[PDB]
Design a protein around this ligand. Sequence first.
Ligand SMILES: NCCSC[C@H]1O[C@@H](n2cnc3c(N)ncnc32)[C@H](O)[C@@H]1O
Length: 390
Amino acid sequence: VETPPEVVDFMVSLAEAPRGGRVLEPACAHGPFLRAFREAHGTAYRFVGVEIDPKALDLPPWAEGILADFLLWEPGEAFDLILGNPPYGIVGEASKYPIHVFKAVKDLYKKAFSTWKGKYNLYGAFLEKAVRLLKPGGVLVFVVPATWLVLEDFALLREFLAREGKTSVYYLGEVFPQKKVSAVVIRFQKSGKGLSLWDTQESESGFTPILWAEYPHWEGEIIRFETEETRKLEISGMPLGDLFHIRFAARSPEFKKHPAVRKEPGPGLVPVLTGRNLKPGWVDYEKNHSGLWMPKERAKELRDFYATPHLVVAHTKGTRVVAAWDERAYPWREEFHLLPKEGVRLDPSSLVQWLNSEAMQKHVRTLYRDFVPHLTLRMLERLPVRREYG
DNA sequence: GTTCGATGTC
DNA sequence: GACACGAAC
Ligand SMILES: NCCSC[C@H]1O[C@@H](n2cnc3c(N)ncnc32)[C@H](O)[C@@H]1O
């Protein structure tokens, strides 16, 4: 993975250090960011690049190279500027996750990083480590996925950044050819407070930032592209989450270990449904996408809520709200299952129609763009619906 | 109990 | 680019 020139040039344009300052590129390989910074600002800095793979470290004589795991590296002195493109990926078993480290090393990461949460990600660890390595007033400029703007795994990271300094986020989107990742640049300075959210446009010099919104009192809340229209709609209604318990489907292994589940159709069995069975306002009960079948009546053994008809909302159709009332109460292996709270009196068809509306699709696309390939729980619970009495 | 993807597929 | 599962906690 190489960082496109326009991205490097844009990041360097945001970068700042005092003359004689210490400039660091983590995960540097050949040090494209060190090289670009030097080209743009000249030679009067102390340049350092840290690389775990001795075969990849390839810095000119004017830079100090360090052969180490950046996440476990303890330099003698802090830095004025840290810039670069850290590795992205979840640490875990190779059959399922891309980053492979000895268990002892993962334990060491968890010990080191106060922001480490859930499965987490190398890029979040790199962000925390870099902030920790910054002098007061120091600056970090990274390109990372947009997922930390909204995901629960990054809640402690956002809160950490909010209390450690001031943050600017510049949305780039899908800028790495033949990678699906939607990217942002983060410029964090280890002083002051607040969040500024920026859009970008491609331009000759790389990208031109366009200030979108300012949040001077940011405390680590999810970051979204709000507009007059999204804000008004949220104020007009009430949160969907205040009317429904939101649960997720039982997972594939739960079905696999259930004594009534089969891998072939047969008398008295129905397909275990997935997201590919959910459509806007209807459910395809016929087509099997899971490879799994079971007696419909026994689905309640996996989750009690499978016993009765209820609203189902899609998780993996991108930044979209796709909803249906499952009138048959089938077993599901995927999707959100919404159960009305005490005293809520719902008209399902009316709600389904609203959730599936163009206005709702425009709403979520606006707020969340393409940061993640899902509608998440945090997004879903905030969807505006009619205010309900008491 | 539920989260996440430099996801993959075509 | 439309449309999408189990290891991890
Ligand atoms: N900066 C370009 C993308 S990140 C890929 C590079 O980071 C290096 N790398 C991966 N994990 C690292 C770590 N924990 N510490 C330092 N370098 C790392 C890889 O060897 C590779 O050269």
